[PDB]
Amino acid sequence: QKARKAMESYNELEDSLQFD
Amino acid sequence: SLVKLANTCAHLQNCSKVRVALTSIPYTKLQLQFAYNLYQQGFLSSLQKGSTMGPDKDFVEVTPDNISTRRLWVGLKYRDNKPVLSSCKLISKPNSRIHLPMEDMKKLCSGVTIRNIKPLQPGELILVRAHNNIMDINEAISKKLDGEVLCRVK
Amino acid sequence: KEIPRYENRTIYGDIDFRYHGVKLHLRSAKPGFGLRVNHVIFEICECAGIKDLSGKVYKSRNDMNIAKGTIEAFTKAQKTLDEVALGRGKKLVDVRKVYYSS
Amino acid sequence: ATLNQIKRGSGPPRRKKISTAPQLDQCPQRKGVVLRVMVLKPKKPNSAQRKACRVRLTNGNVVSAYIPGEGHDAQEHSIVYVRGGRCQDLPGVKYHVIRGAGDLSGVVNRISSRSKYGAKKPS
Amino acid sequence: FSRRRIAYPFYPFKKLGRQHPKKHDTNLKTAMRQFLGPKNYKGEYVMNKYFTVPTNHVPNYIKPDLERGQSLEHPVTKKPLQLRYDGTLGPPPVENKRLQNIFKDRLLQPFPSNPHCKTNYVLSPQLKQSIFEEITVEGLSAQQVSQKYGLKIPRVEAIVKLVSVENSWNRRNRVSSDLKTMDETLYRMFPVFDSDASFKRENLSEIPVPQKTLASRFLTIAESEPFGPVDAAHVLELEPAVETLRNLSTVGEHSSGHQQSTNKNTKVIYGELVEGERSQYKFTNAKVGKVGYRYGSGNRDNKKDRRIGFNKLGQMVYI
RNA sequence: AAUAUGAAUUAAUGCGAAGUUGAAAUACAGUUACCGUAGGGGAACCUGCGGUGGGCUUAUAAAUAUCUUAAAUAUUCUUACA
RNA sequence: AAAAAUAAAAUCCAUAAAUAAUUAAAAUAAUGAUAUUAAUUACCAUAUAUUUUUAUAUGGAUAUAUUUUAAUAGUCCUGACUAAUAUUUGUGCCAGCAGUCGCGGUAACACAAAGAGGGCGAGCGUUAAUCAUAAUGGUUUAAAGGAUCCGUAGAAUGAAUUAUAUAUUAUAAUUUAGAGUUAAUAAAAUUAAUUAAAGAAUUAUAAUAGUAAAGAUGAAAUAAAUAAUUAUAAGACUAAUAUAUGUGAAAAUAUUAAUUAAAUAUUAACUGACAUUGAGGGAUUAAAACUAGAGUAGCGAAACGGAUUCGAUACCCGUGUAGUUCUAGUAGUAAACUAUGAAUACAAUUAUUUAUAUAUAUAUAUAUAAAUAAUAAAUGAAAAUGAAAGUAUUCCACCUGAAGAGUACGUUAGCAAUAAUGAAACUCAAAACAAUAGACGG
RNA sequence: UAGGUAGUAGGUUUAUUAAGAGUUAAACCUAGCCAACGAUCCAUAAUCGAUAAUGAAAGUUAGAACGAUCACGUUGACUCUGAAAUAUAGUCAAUAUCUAUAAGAUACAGCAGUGAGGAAUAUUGGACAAUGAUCGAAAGAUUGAUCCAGUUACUUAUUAGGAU
Numbered sequence A: 001q002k003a004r005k006a007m008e009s010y011n012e013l014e015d016s017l018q019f020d
Numbered sequence B: 001s002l003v004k005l006a007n008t009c010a011h012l013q014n015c016s017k018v019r020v021a022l023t024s025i026p027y028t029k030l031q032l033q034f035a036y037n038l039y040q041q042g043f044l045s046s047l048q049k050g051s052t053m054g055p056d057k058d059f060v061e062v063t064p065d066n067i068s069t070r071r072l073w074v075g076l077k078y079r080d081n082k083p084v085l086s087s088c089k090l091i092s093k094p095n096s097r098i099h100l101p102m103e104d105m106k107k108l109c110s111g112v113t114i115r116n117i118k119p120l121q122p123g124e125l126i127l128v129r130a131h132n133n134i135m136d137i138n139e140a141i142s143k144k145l146d147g148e149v150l151c152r153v154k
Numbered sequence C: 001k002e003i004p005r006y007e008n009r010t011i012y013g014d015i016d017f018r019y020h021g022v023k024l025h026l027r028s029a030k031p032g033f034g035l036r037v038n039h040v041i042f043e044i045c046e047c048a049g050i051k052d053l054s055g056k057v058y059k060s061r062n063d064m065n066i067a068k069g070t071i072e073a074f075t076k077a078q079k080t081l082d083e084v085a086l087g088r089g090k091k092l093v094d095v096r097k098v099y100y101s102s
Numbered sequence D: 001a002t003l004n005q006i007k008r009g010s011g012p013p014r015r016k017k018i019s020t021a022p023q024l025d026q027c028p029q030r031k032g033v034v035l036r037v038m039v040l041k042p043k044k045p046n047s048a049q050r051k052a053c054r055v056r057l058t059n060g061n062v063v064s065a066y067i068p069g070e071g072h073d074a075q076e077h078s079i080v081y082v083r084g085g086r087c088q089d090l091p092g093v094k095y096h097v098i099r100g101a102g103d104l105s106g107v108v109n110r111i112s113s114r115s116k117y118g119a120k121k122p123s
Numbered sequence E: 001f002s003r004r005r006i007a008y009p010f011y012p013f014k015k016l017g018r019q020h021p022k023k024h025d026t027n028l029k030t031a032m033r034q035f036l037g038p039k040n041y042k043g044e045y046v047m048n049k050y051f052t053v054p055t056n057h058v059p060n061y062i063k064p065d066l067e068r069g070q071s072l073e074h075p076v077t078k079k080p081l082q083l084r085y086d087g088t089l090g091p092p093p094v095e096n097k098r099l100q101n102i103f104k105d106r107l108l109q110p111f112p113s114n115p116h117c118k119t120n121y122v123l124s125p126q127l128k129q130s131i132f133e134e135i136t137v138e139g140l141s142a143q144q145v146s147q148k149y150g151l152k153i154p155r156v157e158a159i160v161k162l163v164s165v166e167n168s169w170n171r172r173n174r175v176s177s178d179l180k181t182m183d184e185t186l187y188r189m190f191p192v193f194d195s196d197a198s199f200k201r202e203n204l205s206e207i208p209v210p211q212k213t214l215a216s217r218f219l220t221i222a223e224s225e226p227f228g229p230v231d232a233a234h235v236l237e238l239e240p241a242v243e244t245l246r247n248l249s250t251v252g253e254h255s256s257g258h259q260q261s262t263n264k265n266t267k268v269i270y271g272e273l274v275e276g277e278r279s280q281y282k283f284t285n286a287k288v289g290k291v292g293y294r295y296g297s298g299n300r301d302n303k304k305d306r307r308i309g310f311n312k313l314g315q316m317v318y319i
Numbered sequence F: 001a002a003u004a005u006g007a008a009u010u011a012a013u014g015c016g017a018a019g020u021u022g023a024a025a026u027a028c029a030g031u032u033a034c035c036g037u038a039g040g041g042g043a044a045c046c047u048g049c050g051g052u053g054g055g056c057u058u059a060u061a062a063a064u065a066u067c068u069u070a071a072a073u074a075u076u077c078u079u080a081c082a
Numbered sequence G: 001a002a003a004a005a006u007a008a009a010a011u012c013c014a015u016a017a018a019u020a021a022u023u024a025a026a027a028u029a030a031u032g033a034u035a036u037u038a039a040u041u042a043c044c045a046u047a048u049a050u051u052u053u054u055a056u057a058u059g060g061a062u063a064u065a066u067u068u069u070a071a072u073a074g075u076c077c078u079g080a081c082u083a084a085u086a087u088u089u090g091u092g093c094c095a096g097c098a099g100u101c102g103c104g105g106u107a108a109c110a111c112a113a114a115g116a117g118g119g120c121g122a123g124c125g126u127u128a129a130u131c132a133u134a135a136u137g138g139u140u141u142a143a144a145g146g147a148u149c150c151g152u153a154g155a156a157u158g159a160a161u162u163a164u165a166u167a168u169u170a171u172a173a174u175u176u177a178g179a180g181u182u183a184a185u186a187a188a189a190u191u192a193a194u195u196a197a198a199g200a201a202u203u204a205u206a207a208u209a210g211u212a213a214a215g216a217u218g219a220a221a222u223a224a225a226u227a228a229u230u231a232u233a234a235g236a237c238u239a240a241u242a243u244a245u246g247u248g249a250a251a252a253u254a255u256u257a258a259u260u261a262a263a264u265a266u267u268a269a270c271u272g273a274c275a276u277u278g279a280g281g282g283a284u285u286a287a288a289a290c291u292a293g294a295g296u297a298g299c300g301a302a303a304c305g306g307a308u309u310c311g312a313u314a315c316c317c318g319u320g321u322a323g324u325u326c327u328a329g330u331a332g333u334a335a336a337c338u339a340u341g342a343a344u345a346c347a348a349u350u351a352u353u354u355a356u357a358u359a360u361a362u363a364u365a366u367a368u369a370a371a372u373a374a375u376a377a378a379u380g381a382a383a384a385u386g387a388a389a390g391u392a393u394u395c396c397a398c399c400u401g402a403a404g405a406g407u408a409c410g411u412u413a414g415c416a417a418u419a420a421u422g423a424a425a426c427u428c429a430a431a432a433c434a435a436u437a438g439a440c441g442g
Numbered sequence H: 001u002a003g004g005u006a007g008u009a010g011g012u013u014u015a016u017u018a019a020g021a022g023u024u025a026a027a028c029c030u031a032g033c034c035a036a037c038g039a040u041c042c043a044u045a046a047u048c049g050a051u052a053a054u055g056a057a058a059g060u061u062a063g064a065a066c067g068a069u070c071a072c073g074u075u076g077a078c079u080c081u082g083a084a085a086u087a088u089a090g091u092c093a094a095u096a097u098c099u100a101u102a103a104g105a106u107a108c109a110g111c112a113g114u115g116a117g118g119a120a121u122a123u124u125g126g127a128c129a130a131u132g133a134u135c136g137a138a139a140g141a142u143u144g145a146u147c148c149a150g151u152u153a154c155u156u157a158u159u160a161g162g163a164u
C-alpha cells in the first residue's frame, strides 16, 4: 500500500511543481 | 485457383522481405493476368514466360509436353531502400468468396467498409475478377461490371 | 525525427502496426475531424502536428509501449504519395484537392 | 477458431454486468420483516461492530441487510424496505435497508447527505 | 494534475500588505482598483485607457500582454501613468517599446488569446447610398456591385434592404437625436471599408464545402495523364466547383440569373367564398402514397429532441 | 407419468476466525518431484509398478614444433622513377 | 497571492400577474364540453399618413397629464479513478465510510461537521434494469491440441487449357504438375504376428573336501554353515555392439534363426484430380487393476518382525503374500510430452552426416534431396522458435477469472476397480506466465 | 430429453366441403416418415415495424406509448344462425356469488371505482361542441367510442430579471 500509492500523490505533486 | 493465388501473394511478400530481384510463379491464366496487372500498375519491373530453371530468352511454345515445367518470372522493384511491393493479400478467400455489385465497389473506393473489407487506401491496388478477366476495381466501376473482389496490393 | 504528414494535418491512409504487445489501428480523417484516439496518442499527435486522426488500441495498452509504437508507426508504416508515385512510375492525384483547384 | 467452427457457435464471450441482488427479483426494492437484528465483525483488516439485520422479504427470500448510519431503531417484527448493495467487509450481507422507510427512522441529527439517510430538511 | 486556481492577474501588481483588521480586502479587489484607477465624484474612471470610446476609426482593444497590465494614462495627453511607492500616478521610468509599433492585424483583434477573431469593417454612409442607387435606380445586378466594391452578394442585398428602412425612418422623422448621436459614435469606433484597398476586399470565390467531398479519394493514373477540376468533379459525382460558385451568385434577389418558375405546375383550387363565411378553402393536388399523416410514426413529444417550431404569428408551437 | 412445493432423512463444499498434531512441498527442502494406478496409515502422507523433467546438456585439455645470403641489400621513400 | 464578495443593500429600467377593455380559432345553416378560452391592448372610438411599425389629429372619457406592478432552489460531491488548494474542529481500528483501490490505532484532504470549493438543476441522489465500453482473439511455457491413427457425412476445402452457358458456378472436351497402379533397376534387413533356438547369471537341492563363523548396515539387530569345486532342476531376463541411430499411427521396438505381412530410391509405362481434412464412428493403446487356467527363480504393495527416533503407521534390514511371467479375455486410462493436430505453397546462410546420380588425370570432385546443429529475416509477454512458434491457405479439436470441480446428480459402458459425459449455487478481486535484482541453499 | 412416430410416411377409393390434403370418418394396400446441421420431449414467451433505447457500425434490448397481426372476454365442450362464429350468443357441465327458489340471474380483461397482491401506476369528472359509429324517410335519439378536464415532476419543452 505504501510504495504503490505513495507515488501517485508525489508524481501528481511533481506536476504541481511544473506549474509553480 | 484462389489457393494458388494465395500462395503467390504470400510468395511475393517473402521475396520482398529478402529483396530478391527475380522470382517465379506458377504458369496459369489467372497468374498471368494477376502478374500483368501488377506490371502495368508499376509493382513489377518485368514479366517473362519461362521454365523451372529461368526465364526464356527466346520464345518457347507451351504444349502438353512442357506445361508441367512452365513458370512465370517476375522482377521485383525496390526504391529508396524500401520495397515497392510491400504487401499482397487476398480479399475473397477460398472458404469465403465475396462478390460485389458495382454499387458496392464504388462505396469501397469511397471509404465505406463493405462486408468487412477495409476501404481502398491511397496508392493501393484492388483487383477484381469478372468473367475470368482481372482488372482494377476502378476499371470495373468504369465498365459497370459486377465481380469478385480478389486481392489488394500495396 | 520528421514524420510524414498528409496536408500537414493527418497521416497517409490507414496504419495497422504491431509494436510488441500493442496493436495500433490508426485511420486518417477529414479536415476538422479532430483527434479521436488513445490519450497517449493524443499527446504525441499534438506535439507532432497531427490534427485529425482516428484509431483504436488492441491487446496491450501499456502507455510506454503505445508511445514508442506510435512514433515507430508514423515513420516505418507511412509512405508519401510522392514516394509511391516514384516507386511505381505513376501519377497519384488527390481528387478532393483537384476539385477545388483552378 | 475456423470459419466453420464460428458457424457452429464459436465466438467471443459477451460482456454484460451480472445481477448482484438476485433476491429482489429485479425490483428496485422489496418490503420485508426483520427476523433478528445482529452485530457482525468485519473481515480483516477492518475492525468494527457492524449493525446488520436478517429480513424475510415479501417474496419469501430471507436476506441479510446492512443498516447504514449512526444509530438505528430497528427491532424484530419491524417493517423494513431492502434495496441492492453489498457490505464489502461483511461477507454474505448483500443488501441495504433504506433509512426513513417503513419502521426504520432516519439518522438522528444527520446534516450532510440527508437524502441517503432519510433525514428531512431542518427549518 | 489539477487544482483550484484563483484567477490572479498574470502581470505584476501591488499585493496587499499588512491590513487593518476591518478592511477585509482581497488581492483580486486591489488588483482591480489598480486596473481601474481612481473613481471620481461622478462615478467615472478617467485614468483608465479604456473608459472612453475611440473617435478615429481605430478600435481600442485591450492589450494587457503588450502593456504588462498598465492600463492607466493621462485623460487628455494619453501619456502612460503608473503607480509609484507614494501611492500616486506618474510617468513610467522606461518607455514601453511593445506599444509603439503594433501590427496592423493586432489592432483589429479584440481578444488577446484568439488571433483568428477580427472585427469587421463598417461601410461608410456614402458607399451604402451608392450601392442602393445602383441596384435600385441604375438597375445594376448584385453580382456586378459585388464584383465592383468587393462585397459578398448577401451583404450587398442586405445594404439595399437596410437603406430602404432608413429612408422610411427619415421620411417619418423617426431617427431621433439620440439615435443619430449613437450611430455616429459607433461609426467612429470601427475601421471604415475601402473598396480600393485590396486587403480590405472580401473574398468572392467562397463556396460551401460539401460532405461527400470532404473525404480524401486518390486515383493512380498514368504518369503523363492530365487530371483537372472537371475530371475530379466527375469522380466525385458533383457539379464543377466553378459552376457551384456561379449558381451561388445568381441567388441574390437583385442578381442576374435569379429564376423560379419550374414549380408552377401544381394544380390548386380556391373554394367558392359566400357572404358570411369567415374563411376560404384552398385545395392543393397531391398523390396517394405521399400525402397524409403516416400511421405509427415515432412520437418524440416525451423525448429530448421533440420538434418545436414557430407559426406565422411568432408563437411557439409543437410540430 | 410428468411439473412444482414442502419434507423425515442424508451427501458434498466454501469462508471466517482460531488453535492443535506433525513437518509433506519450494535449495540436492535434507528419501528427486510430479503423472497414472494399487495397497496401507491420526493427519499431512508412506510403499509398489511404469512413465515424465516441470532435476543432474549443471556438459570445458593425457603439455611438448623446423635450415639460407641481418643488411654496402629489408627497414627510409611524399606523384618520383619509369 | 486567503478569501467569503458584485456577493448584499442601494440606484436605474422593465415585464409577468392583477385590474380594465377587447376578443379570435377549434364550426358552422345552427350548435363550443374545454372555458373565468388563447391572444391583444393599456382611458375607448375614428380619420389621415404610416414592411413592420410609427406618427399626427381627432370624437367621446377622467384630473396639463391619464390602472397597477413584482421576484428566497434544491440535491450530490471535493484521497485516486474524477471536476472540486483557504483552512479548521470532533472522533481515535471506536463511531462510521466504501462503485473499485481502500479510509479510521491522536497533524483523518476519505468517518461526523464548519469555512471555502466542484457538478447537475425543478430537480439531485440512490436502487433495479438495457445498450455501449477488445476477439481489426487465443491453445510450447499463462484457461485451451483429442493417446494415436483409419475413415463416413460435411448444407467443408481442393489442379491445368479451351468452348459454351443462364457464369468464381455448371456442363463438355482436352491436359498432367496433386494423388495413385504396374513393372524394371538398385538398396535395406527393420517393424508386426508366429514357430524354433542360444547365452551369462541367479536360487534351490545333492556331493566333495575344508573349516567356525557367516550375512547385513552409517553402526546394528532380526531371520557341519558361508566361501570353493562339481552335478541336477526351475523360472525370469537379454552384456558388449548402441546412437532408440533407425523402425512403427501412437503405445512401442535392440540375444539368434525361420515363415507370413508391410515398408525405400530412381527410371519406364499407365490412370486422369480419383485429393486434403475429418463431426459422428472405428481400430490400436504403457504401468497398475480385474476374470479363468497354468507358472512362480528373482524382485516385491500388504502383513508380521529387526532397527533408527522424543515418537517413526516411514526412509534402512529380515521373512516375504498379491503382483511382476505365459495363455484366453475385460477395461481404454498416463507428465499417453515435442506439455507444440494434420495438409499444402513459400523465404536468407553455414556446418556435419546419409542417399542417389555424375564424372574422371582414381580416388576424390560436382550435383540434387533428407536428417541434424548453429543462425539471418520474421515472429513473440518474453524464455525463445527457425524451416516453424516465420509468410500464407484449408480442415478438425479445444479455451474464455480464481476457487468450487473434472466434484455433485443423471445417463451410458464394464465382472469389478472404474471410464466417458459433465453442472449450478455460495465466496472472492483475485489468479497466472516470462523475465529482472536480491536473499537463501544440509 | 436420443431415439421418436403407428393415421404414424406413402398409394387407391368413397363420405364431407365452394375447394386441395390421413383435415375428419370408413375401407383396402405399401413400409415407410423424422432425427447429433438436434428429432421427440420439457421449460419459457403473445409476435412484429418506416416504434422506443443503445452503439461508429454489424448488432443488442424492449414490445409501455404509436401502428400492424394473433389469441382471449370466469373454465371446458358442443350446437344454431350466417359468406364467415366451437361467437362476450345458445346448450350442458365446472367454480364463485346473488334473489325471485326458478331446468333462475350474475362473472368490470368497456369506463369510473373498491378490496387484495405489490417497490409501484390516476377521477365513482364534463360534453356529445368536434371526428366517428348505430337507428330513423326526416325531424332527431343514442354513444365511458371519442373529445375535453381532474390526479400524478413519470417523460419532454418553455419560462422562472436585466443594467448599475
Ligand SMILES: [K+]
Pocket: none
Ligand atoms: K516427499
Ligand SMILES: [K+]
Pocket: none
Ligand atoms: K502417483
Ligand SMILES: [K+]
Pocket: none
Ligand atoms: K504412487
Ligand SMILES: [K+]
Pocket: none
Ligand atoms: K450546489
Ligand SMILES: [K+]
Pocket: none
Ligand atoms: K503462446
Ligand SMILES: [K+]
Pocket: G244
Ligand atoms: K527412435
Ligand SMILES: [K+]
Pocket: G272
Ligand atoms: K478430365
Ligand SMILES: [K+]
Pocket: none
Ligand atoms: K472426404
Ligand SMILES: [K+]
Pocket: none
Ligand atoms: K471421430
Ligand SMILES: [K+]
Pocket: G296
Ligand atoms: K512369484
Ligand SMILES: [K+]
Pocket: F052, G337
Ligand atoms: K517427453
Ligand SMILES: [K+]
Pocket: G341, G342, G396, G397
Ligand atoms: K485433428
Ligand SMILES: [K+]
Pocket: H038
Ligand atoms: K431439442
Ligand SMILES: [K+]
Pocket: none
Ligand atoms: K397499462
Ligand SMILES: [K+]
Pocket: H128
Ligand atoms: K357526437
Ligand SMILES: [Mg+2]
Pocket: D113
Ligand atoms: Mg457520505
